[PDB]
Amino acid sequence: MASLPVLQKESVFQSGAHAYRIPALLYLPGQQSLLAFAEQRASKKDEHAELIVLRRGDYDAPTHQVQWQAQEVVAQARLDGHRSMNPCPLYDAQTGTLFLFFIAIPGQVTEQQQLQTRANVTRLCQVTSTDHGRTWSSPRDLTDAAIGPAYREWSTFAVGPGHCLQLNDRARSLVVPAYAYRKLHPIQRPIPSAFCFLSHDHGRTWARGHFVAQDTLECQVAEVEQRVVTLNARSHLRARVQAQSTNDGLDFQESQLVKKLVEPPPQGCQGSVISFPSPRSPAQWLLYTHPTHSWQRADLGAYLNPRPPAPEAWSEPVLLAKGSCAYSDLQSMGTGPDGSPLFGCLYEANDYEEIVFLMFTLKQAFPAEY
Numbered sequence: 001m002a003s004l005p006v007l008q009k010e011s012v013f014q015s016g017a018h019a020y021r022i023p024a025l026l027y028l029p030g031q032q033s034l035l036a037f038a039e040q041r042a043s044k045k046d047e048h049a050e051l052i053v054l055r056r057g058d059y060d061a062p063t064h065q066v067q068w069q070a071q072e073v074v075a076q077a078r079l080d081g082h083r084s085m086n087p088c089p090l091y092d093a094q095t096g097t098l099f100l101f102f103i104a105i106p107g108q109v110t111e112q113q114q115l116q117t118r119a120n121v122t123r124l125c126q127v128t129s130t131d132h133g134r135t136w137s138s139p140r141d142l143t144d145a146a147i148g149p150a151y152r153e154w155s156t157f158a159v160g161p162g163h164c165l166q167l168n169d170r171a172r173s174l175v176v177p178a179y180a181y182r183k184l185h186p187i188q189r190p191i192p193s194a195f196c197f198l199s200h201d202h203g204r205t206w207a208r209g210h211f212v213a214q215d216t217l218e219c220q221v222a223e224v225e226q227r228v229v230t231l232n233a234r235s236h237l238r239a240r241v242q243a244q245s246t247n248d249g250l251d252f253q254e255s256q257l258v259k260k261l262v263e264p265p266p267q268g269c270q271g272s273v274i275s276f277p278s279p280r281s282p283a284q285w286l287l288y289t290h291p292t293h294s295w296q297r298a299d300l301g302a303y304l305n306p307r308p309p310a311p312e313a314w315s316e317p318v319l320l321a322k323g324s325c326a327y328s329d330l331q332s333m334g335t336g337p338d339g340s341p342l343f344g345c346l347y348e349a350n351d352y353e354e355i356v357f358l359m360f361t362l363k364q365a366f367p368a369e370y
């Protein structure tokens with residue numbers, strides 16, 4: 001009945017003068033340290049988002065523990081008179097440039113307002129850093145160059161939330177997952193769909209990836225063995241929707257509903273997925289974390305997929321945290337102290353009053369595999 005015994009469990013963000021929701025985790029391999037982002041909201045309500053905070057954590061080897069440095073505001077991540085939300089970090093392994101994509105919405109203008117008004121006022125922004133997050137660039141509002149023509153086709157949009165992807169294609173392309181509320185019917189309300197923002201010139205210029213099966217929300221993507229881009233998305237149904245792309249995220253040919261991966265009643269809850277080298281035919285497996293309770297957001301579980309992307313291959317979950325659990329973001333941290341794949345997990349806990357950092361090896365969560 002207890003949670004899974006892990007290598008680490010520390011509360012990295014807590015309620016105080018501000019509340020903190022919507023976590024993001026980035027593993028800088030050349031540093032052997034993580035970057036944890038989160039929304040610093042004046043309250044726990046979405047419209048009360050304000051800026052994005054950051055904390056750098058450095059993995060100590062002798063102790064197999066991570067040590068976080070004081071939290072700080074990524075002051076640059078924001079547009080004049082706009083709030084910031086949905087941090088989506090990504091490290092370009094080739095140029096060594098750190099990217100932090102985010103959303104900028106005018107003051108306290110709600111999401112709901114944009115939806116029932118069918119008037120998109122959200123803006124796609126990004127900030128870069130060439131010193132591991134120590135200093136950032138001036139914010140770059142990509143709204144025009146990435147969306148442009150389609151901006152009026154959406155009631156509203158958002159990126160992530162969570163870490164992004166960089167394919168191992170000829171050009172090492174950046175893939176920023178997302179979803180959008182598309183105005184398709186004159187009467188029927190706009191239905192959201194997942195999709196990815198693509199870039200093949202290392203952030204110079206972006207492009208919109210094509211949508212997936214209707215009714216998909218926040219999502220994440222991971223690459224796996226020829227070469228595919230599996231995407232896991234939140235849905236208003238009662239289970240996760242996943243899809244595969246064989247053309248580097250430009251289109252998703254296959255799209256199914258995975259019943260083994262449940263979703264809470266309202267409109268589900270953001271979950272997270274990543275891939276890692278396979279311990280033992282396929283070169284990689286997938287790991288996913290999301291609440292396992294079916295009525296509410298609680299009991300964050302970890303799911304394993306040893307035959308990606310076969311839907312039915314997903315495993316039964318393992319309890320990572322008992323009680324109130326919401327959003328989360330995973331990260332492949334390489335080889336763990338016990339020679340198993342190492343994982344870094346950031347998750348929303350206790351009625352959104354703290355964001356917890358979890359660290360465990362594949363051997364701890366899925367011993368059955370060994």
Ligand SMILES: CC(=O)N[C@H]1[C@H]([C@H](O)[C@H](O)CO)OC(C(=O)O)=C[C@@H]1O
Pocket residue numbers: 022046085086103111158192217218267268269270
């Ligand atoms: C950009 C934004 O406001 N995202 C919000 C998201 C969104 O409303 C839903 O995915 C429908 O699109 O919902 C939730 C949530 O706790 O479930 C918090 C997020 O901050």
